[PDB]
Amino acid sequence: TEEFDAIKIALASPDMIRSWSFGEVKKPETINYRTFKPERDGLFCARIFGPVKDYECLCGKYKRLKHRGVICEKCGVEVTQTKVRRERMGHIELASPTAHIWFLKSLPSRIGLLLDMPLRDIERVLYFESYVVIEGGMTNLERQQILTEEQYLDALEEFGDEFDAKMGAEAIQALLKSMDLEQECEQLREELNETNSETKRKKLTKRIKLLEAFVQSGNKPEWMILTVLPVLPPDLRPLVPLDGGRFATSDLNDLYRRVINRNNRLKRLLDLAAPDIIVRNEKRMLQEAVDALLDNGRRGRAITGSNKRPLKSLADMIKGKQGRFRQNLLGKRVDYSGRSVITVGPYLRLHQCGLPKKMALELFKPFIYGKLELRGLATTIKAAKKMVEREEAVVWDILDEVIREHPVLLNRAPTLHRLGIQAFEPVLIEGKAIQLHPLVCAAYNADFDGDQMAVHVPLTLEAQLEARALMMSTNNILSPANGEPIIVPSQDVVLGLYYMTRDCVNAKGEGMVLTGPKEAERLYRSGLASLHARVKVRITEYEKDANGELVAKTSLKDTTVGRAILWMIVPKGLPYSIVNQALGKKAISKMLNTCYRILGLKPTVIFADQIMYTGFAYAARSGASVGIDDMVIPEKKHEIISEAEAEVAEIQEQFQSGLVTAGERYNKVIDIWAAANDRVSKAMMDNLQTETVINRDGQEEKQVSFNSIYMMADSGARGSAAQIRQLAGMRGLMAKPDGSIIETPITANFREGLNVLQYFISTHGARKGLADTALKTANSGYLTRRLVDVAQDLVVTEDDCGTHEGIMMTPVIEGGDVKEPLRDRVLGRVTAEDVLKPGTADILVPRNTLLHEQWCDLLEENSVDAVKVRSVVSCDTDFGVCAHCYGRDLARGHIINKGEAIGVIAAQSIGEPGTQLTMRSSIQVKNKGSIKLSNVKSVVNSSGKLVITSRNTELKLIDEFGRTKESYKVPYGAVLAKGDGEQVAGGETVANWDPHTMPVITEVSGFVRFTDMIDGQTITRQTDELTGLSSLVVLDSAERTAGGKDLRPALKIVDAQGNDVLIPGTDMPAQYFLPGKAIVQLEDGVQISSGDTLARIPQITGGLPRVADLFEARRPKEPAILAEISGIVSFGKETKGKRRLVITPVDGSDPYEEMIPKWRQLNVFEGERVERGDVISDGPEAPHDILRLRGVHAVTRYIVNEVQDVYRLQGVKINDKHIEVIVRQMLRKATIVNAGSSDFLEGEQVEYSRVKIANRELEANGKVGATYSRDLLGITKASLATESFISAASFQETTRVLTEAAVAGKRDELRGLKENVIVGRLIPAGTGYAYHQDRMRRRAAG
Amino acid sequence: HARSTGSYSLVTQQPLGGKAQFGGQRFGEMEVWALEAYGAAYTLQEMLTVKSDDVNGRTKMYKNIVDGNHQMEPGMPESFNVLLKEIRSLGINIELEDE
Amino acid sequence: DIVLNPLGVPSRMNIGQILETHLGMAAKGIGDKINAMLKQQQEVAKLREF
Amino acid sequence: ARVTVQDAVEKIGNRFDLVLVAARRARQMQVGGKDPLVPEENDKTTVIALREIEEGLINNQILDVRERQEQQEQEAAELQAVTAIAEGRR
DNA sequence: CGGAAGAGATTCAGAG
RNA sequence: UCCGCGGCGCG
DNA sequence: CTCTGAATCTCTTCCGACGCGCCGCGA
Ligand SMILES: [Mg+2]
Ligand SMILES: [Zn+2]
Ligand SMILES: [Zn+2]
């Protein structure tokens, strides 16, 4: 229509709004009830808003279009269409101004901070409680002075008419119109440069920028106080009839009426010369009425109606989940849709869904009209309608003709991830249930216990082409969350295949030879041999040769009849070995995956369908079933339980003799019950799992049992070892609601009856779990909404940015366990640098190569330990990411195509598993390797051991090929029994430490001499009359005297002559201070060896909250402090609770001082040389400081590691890319440290793209570029921080962002996805992307 | 339940909700994100503008479908005009640019 | 008359329902026998003792 | 019927570009009424266009040159018509 | 309700 | 031809 | 002994899935 390019917002000038309005409304009247006609000058006055009916005058003067576009003479109504009623806005004119409640009440008082006034004063003047002052030079009274009534009278009775004092509305209007902007701008900036206080500086800066925003928008600030108030058109605030002729009035109409009434009252009291207090009361009521109209409930008590409910003001029509933004602009209701209960249909091919005939007829009724007239069977739409409503079977023939290639979309609420909507080619069935193919039903997360599903039909041919090419289920084989296929069988299919491939030691026809799988099928179907019988069969297989031909091979192999039968369906090219074992769920999954990699898409689809058919058929023929005799109870159980209860009695009587504390008695009982439960479980599994049967020759032999429940568990079709354990073994301990474990475990299994007590205590867990999931759903949905909002802008916009930067990928290893191999972390990513063959300079993998499966296998063969890959966070693309930095698209297998929206994919991929999350002294070598130290400094002693002065060293055990095997952190001062590079074996002790104390280490031998210490002041003389030998303890600051304050207890080391030995490498003396409350085992004046120690020192949350805190950039409550500077630590002044630490740079001239608290244990002893980003004290880690110290790569590695850790603990797989993209989206805001020659002001928040572009052009013309630091804002703030104010207003805090944009004079270019979705043009992603490129070229041409 | 076409609401001009009113299903925001995950722009545009809210575009679409031509002409969602009128009535001036 | 999937039973742990099924097969069993014992129209004393 | 389009996508490479090309081809086949280049077998214009691009007979540049030559034919008809009108006036 | 974040007001410590 | 509010109900 | 800045305390505001189905009531 109007083809707008952007949207602009600003304050409303009163002349502008008056120009909008086609008239003023002056009375609270709406419509007459004798005749349902609007009253003139009323809220629905037709003379203003136009006629109620098309071209119908209120007077009845004219009735048809012959006079279209003329006014009546008897009345001012116009001969036009009713649509104008929707458009035209009225206006009302107030006898007094009124503050617009938004600018007052918004969290920063924009008017208040503009005028520097406290909000209490502003409300006390605007609400008519006090006067305020405007000054004249003859009076000492200054302007903006608050003035109470007694002060008002006191001032006026001496200086009346010399100064002036007014109430809130008029005074604020006059003040705003009586101030200049440039003078206050310059005074504010001069104060900013002259002042120092950071609070004062930030207030000054925000005022400066507010004034700059007002001047650059040119919006006269006084406009913030309304003087003329718009009237919403009648249709948007409809008055709707009711039964009995009543009418429901929209609350907006009542608020408007009240405001009209108050305005009329105030004008009448003014024009008849009322006394002062009366008109003041009336105008205060009018101001309150306007506040109610705009934002009822925003201040004080909310207005309410007869229903005792608060009325919904205008602001409530846009705020909240019922608001206009969320309810209608997004999430429209749609035509051509249906819903129905779903149902299994196994006879369907993969790509076709069974759609009830009635729904098809209803949906395609327009298409049927069309084709029926086209084929000449019906002449007019009435004929078509009457024919289709009579269902003349020719309509059924036409209906079968129309849909033959017409895909439809199936959707299941909630649409957790994009698989939730899929496309199918319909097939017509009588009945009323929609029939799905079970395989895709598994992907839907759907079930068949009564889940409904909704169906939409695309209209246009471009739309149906999109549905076919993109959405058809034959395309969505690979999940976006990971590369593994999503179309995977379960339940009966897996059970059937498992039964079909399981062999037994002796069966009908064992040992015969079959010339081909067809004969195997014959012998099975003719009943002369059972599936399980082992036999030799001649089989042909094929392989993809070096050229790409399917070269054949034929041979005899040992197999089972069932296995040959299954092989017969396998397509050419897969090796026979894939089948020749007991096929579980995982085996079938990897079989489908290997089919998809070796062959194309369509052979895999056909293979899937054939698998489904054969599995179902043979499962049915199997007749597997569950019976009460199957859940065998191991007869050992009674004995084990008697033993356990005997031990319980023993420990209980041991406590009865008082030999132990009750807590340890509880612990012992719990331990023995757990041990007994495990023993019973093992006995049950052993008895169930295997059984003895006679062989062919007549002897007993063991084999895997065909017990039904065991077969179901072992196949992986359904159930688990836990459920089997509960079914037959004793189910064990259970927790009280506090999470503590009841001493008496539930002893009876499910097969025997549970007593009432066991059942009752068990119900605790059941209701805990149900409440748990009920609550978790909401948090998961909320989190997903957030992630989507933050990442929705990001789209692949170019092929290659040309960045050599990237991140280093190594396998994730914790505590000697390889939690994640390198192949998974690097598959599908592009090499940032050329990979070299280990130990050589030869290039193994070139730079900028997408690492597919063959490259990963090659990397594994050469045992490459680390790779460097391109990352989303390191991409140089502006307003997007390049295809090479993102890498392989999980859903397709190759490099991602241009124009794909990746952020939304990542957001859904993170959100969906969230439904599954839960929410309420020595080192031993594990295996062979070599010991290496990551970062260490070590000293060796007379005992032959090694003691370490690095506080964050890690042992790493390395493979003979240089790959890592194990790694473990080692505390300060631990003792080590081995040198670096020595060989190690499993179970070998290599290092030791006391975890219950902190030592202090002396590197060189010598004679200790106490220094800077006095007994009873810095140290006190412990003689442990109750414990043992003499000792000395440093007196804490509360215990030490003032003489012990500046004297810091220490010991120097001296030579044999008593001369103070120097540190071996520095000019500092070998001086070792004793921290507060430190303990030393040695007295003054004793010898100590090199590498020897003397010091004694006194020394979890749920997954979903943890991930929420990570992505919200939450500051941890005990932030570890790290060295902001490279230098030497140094002590200094002391004060209450906090120590004045200082770091002194080695070469730098700028020391820094920090208020390090003393209650946290310090890891610094006045000798620790330290570098930037090194830990000074431990604790939870603050992401912002990590970013400041160690850069973007450190923080991205930290975030990805934590999120992957929690998810892998749950067992869900999510590729790192979807976390890295979120991290890059978090990282937009930067701050300017110097402007160079740029126009940017210092300390401003700027989007990283803008400053990057500005610096690039600035250096492109040779000027000094600006410098910046990047700030990790939380995802909520980062989503609100965007320039696209429309998206922000859609998301949260609508009033705040609207006010901010309004005062700013913001403009949004409508470049993201959400904005275009609101507007309704094509999104700039996917197929729409191309449409935009031409447009932008035209916009470049324009 | 199934709805090809029927009644339309007064204020928002969107189709009615619920079986009793013979309304259509709701293409909730989660489904919109699902479409955004695909490159399927055209079906999204059709879902929002023509099928739902364009007071004239859906008439044109009905005409063309009856005629057997699967054209499309996206106008402007009337709910957007409703939002504009409410924001203006609030006293905040908002307007389109580059007409 | 009705065919149910067995796979649900171990994973939902509705073991009791299987027992119900068994009792059902027992219950109608007696019914069937007594039905036949009635259909042959034998002496009521025999069915009384049964 | 068409089980999958993946071969056509391989030919065009960009999946979305395939959708656009097939869309315009089907548009001109339906309203313009130009006949399919391959047998139709009671299929629909959509799958017809998909097969045609699958055979490599139809591609963005091929559409471009076809549109160019059709425009040249139309303008030749216009010029010959106006020359005939002038000959009628003379 | 509870938890988290922001803004304003009040109190304590350090420096003069 | 309709704005809801409250309530249960199934996903 | 006093003043300013920084830190701490108090008060106020915002947020805690999507989807359908019936019943009642309604200044
Ligand atoms: Mg279900
Ligand atoms: Zn008139
Ligand atoms: Zn890049």
Taking the C-alpha atoms of residue A394 and residue A388, their distance in angstroms, rounded to an integer, is 9
- Cα torsion A39, A41, A47, A48 to 10°: value is -130
Contact A1281, A1228 (CB under 8 A): yes
Give A826's DSSP letter: H
A370 vs D: CB within 8 A: no
Residue A549 CB coordination number (10 Å): 10
Question: Which stretches of A971-1080 are assigned E, i.e. beta strand?
Answer: 975-976, 983-984, 989-992, 1001-1002, 1006-1011, 1019-1023, 1030-1034, 1050-1054, 1071-1073, 1079-1080
Give A1186's DSSP letter: H
Q: How does DSSP assign A970-1000, residue by residue?
A: E-TT-EESS-TT-EE-TT-EEEE--TT----
Distance in Å from G16's C1' to A770's CA comes to 18
Determine the longest span between alpha carbons in chain A, in angstroms.
128
Burial of A1063 (0-12, 13-18, 19+ CB in 10 A): middle
Taking the C-alpha atoms of residue A1163 and residue A332, their distance in angstroms, rounded to an integer, is 59
Give the domain ranges of chain D.
1-89
Q: How does DSSP assign A226-281, residue by residue?
A: EEEEEE--TTTS-EEE-GGG-EEEPHHHHHHHHHHHHHHHHHHHHHTT--HHHHHH
Taking the C-alpha atoms of residue A993 and residue A998, their distance in angstroms, rounded to an integer, is 9
Neighboring chains of D (3 or more beta-carbon pairs < 8 A) = A, B
Bond from prior residue into A414 cis (ω within 30 degrees of 0): yes
Half-sphere exposure of A961 (CA within 13 A, CB side): 12
Nearest CA in chain A to D48: A405
Q: How many CB pairs under 8 A join A and D?
A: 68
- Chain B, 45 to 74: residues with Cβ < 8 Å from chain D are 69-71
Write out chain D residues lying below 8 Å of B42, CB-based: 19, 23
Neighboring chains of C (3 or more beta-carbon pairs < 8 A) = A
CB under 8 Å to A541, separation ≥6 — which residues? A552, A553, A554, A574, A575, A576
Six-digit token pair at A669? 């009982």
Half-sphere exposure of A13 (CA within 13 A, CB side): 7
Taking the C-alpha atoms of residue A319 and residue A148, their distance in angstroms, rounded to an integer, is 37
**SS3 breakdown of chain D: % helix, strand, coil, rounded to 5?**
70, 0, 30
Closest CA of chain A from D4, distance in Å: 7
Q: How does DSSP assign A38-94, residue by residue?
A: BPTTSTT-HHHH--SSTT--TTSS--SGGGTT-B-SSS--BS--THHHHH--EEEEE
Which among A491, A624, A750 is the nearest to C13, CB-wise?
A750
SS3 of A1297, please? helix
**Which residues are paired to A946 by β-bridges?**
A940, A976
Q: Phi and psi of D20, rounded to 5°?
A: -65, -45
Please name the amino acid found at residue A1016: G
Burial of A630 (0-12, 13-18, 19+ CB in 10 A): buried
Burial of A1076 (0-12, 13-18, 19+ CB in 10 A): middle
- E strand or H helix at A1259: helix A1248-1260
Taking the C-alpha atoms of residue A1230 and residue A1267, their distance in angstroms, rounded to an integer, is 10
Burial of A309 (0-12, 13-18, 19+ CB in 10 A): exposed
Which among A7, A336, A420 is the nearest to B34, CB-wise?
A420
Which among A236, A901, A908 is the nearest to B11, CB-wise?
A236
For G4, nearest residue by CA–C1' is A197
**Which residues are paired to A544 by β-bridges?**
A550
Nearest in space to A1152 (alpha carbons), one of A1172, A1167, A1136: A1172
- E strand or H helix at A206: helix A198-217
Question: Which stretches of A362-404 are assigned E, i.e. beta strand?
Answer: none
Distance in Å from E7's C1' to A281's CA comes to 31
Residue C32 CB coordination number (10 Å): 10
Among D14, D16, D29, D45, most B C-beta atoms within 10 A, so best to mutate, is D16
Six-digit token pair at A560? 């089972």
Contact A1224, A872 (CB under 8 A): yes
Write out chain A residues lying below 8 Å of D27, CB-based: 461
For G13, nearest residue by CA–C1' is A107
Q: Phi and psi of A701, rounded to 5°?
A: -150, 150
A871: left (phi over 0), alpha (psi -120 to 50) or beta: beta
Distance from the Cα of residue A552 to its chain's centroid: 51
Cα A328 to averaged position of ligand 1 atoms, centre (Å)? 28
CB under 8 Å to A1020, separation ≥6 — which residues? A1032, A1033, A1035, A1039
Q: Phi and psi of A1313, rounded to 5°?
A: -85, -50
Closest CA of chain B from A32, distance in Å: 21
Taking the C-alpha atoms of residue A739 and residue A920, their distance in angstroms, rounded to an integer, is 10
CB under 8 Å to A817, separation ≥6 — which residues? none
Half-sphere exposure of A543 (CA within 13 A, CB side): 8
Q: Provide CATH code, domain D1-89.
A: 3.90.940.10
Six-digit token pair at D16? 């979305």
Which among D6, D27, D42 is the nearest to A601, CB-wise?
D6
- Nucleic strand G near CB of residue A657 (< 7 Å): no
Contact A167, A131 (CB under 8 A): yes
- Nucleic strand E near CB of residue A1168 (< 7 Å): no
Residue A1 CB coordination number (10 Å): 9
Taking the C-alpha atoms of residue D54 and residue A480, their distance in angstroms, rounded to an integer, is 27
Resolution in units of Å: 4.3
Taking the C-alpha atoms of residue A593 and residue A1312, their distance in angstroms, rounded to an integer, is 36
Contact A833, A797 (CB under 8 A): no
**Which residues are paired to A513 by β-bridges?**
A536
CB under 8 Å to A1330, separation ≥6 — which residues? A899, D16, D17, D20
Angle, CA of A1011, A1015 and A1017, to the nearest 5°? 95
Nearest in space to A1280 (alpha carbons), one of A1267, A1296, A1264, A1265: A1296
Six-digit token pair at A450? 């009564």
Taking the C-alpha atoms of residue A10 and residue A223, their distance in angstroms, rounded to an integer, is 10
Among B38, B69, B70, B73, most D C-beta atoms within 10 A, so best to mutate, is B70
Nearest CA in chain C to A754: C16
Q: Would you say how long chain A is, in residues?
A: 1342
Nearest in space to B76 (alpha carbons), one of B99, B96, B39, B50: B50
Q: Which nucleotides of G are covered by protein (CB under 7 A)?
A: 4-7, 13-22, 26-27
Determination technique for this PDB entry?
cryo-EM
The gap between the terminal CA atoms of chain B, to the nearest Å, is 43
CB contact under 8 A, D17 and A470: no
Taking the C-alpha atoms of residue A254 and residue A859, their distance in angstroms, rounded to an integer, is 74
- Nucleic strand E near CB of residue A205 (< 7 Å): no
Residue D39 CB coordination number (10 Å): 8
CB under 8 Å to D64, separation ≥6 — which residues? none
Contact A85, A231 (CB under 8 A): no
Closest CA of chain A from D33, distance in Å: 15
Burial of A1285 (0-12, 13-18, 19+ CB in 10 A): buried
CB contact under 8 A, A1326 and B40: yes
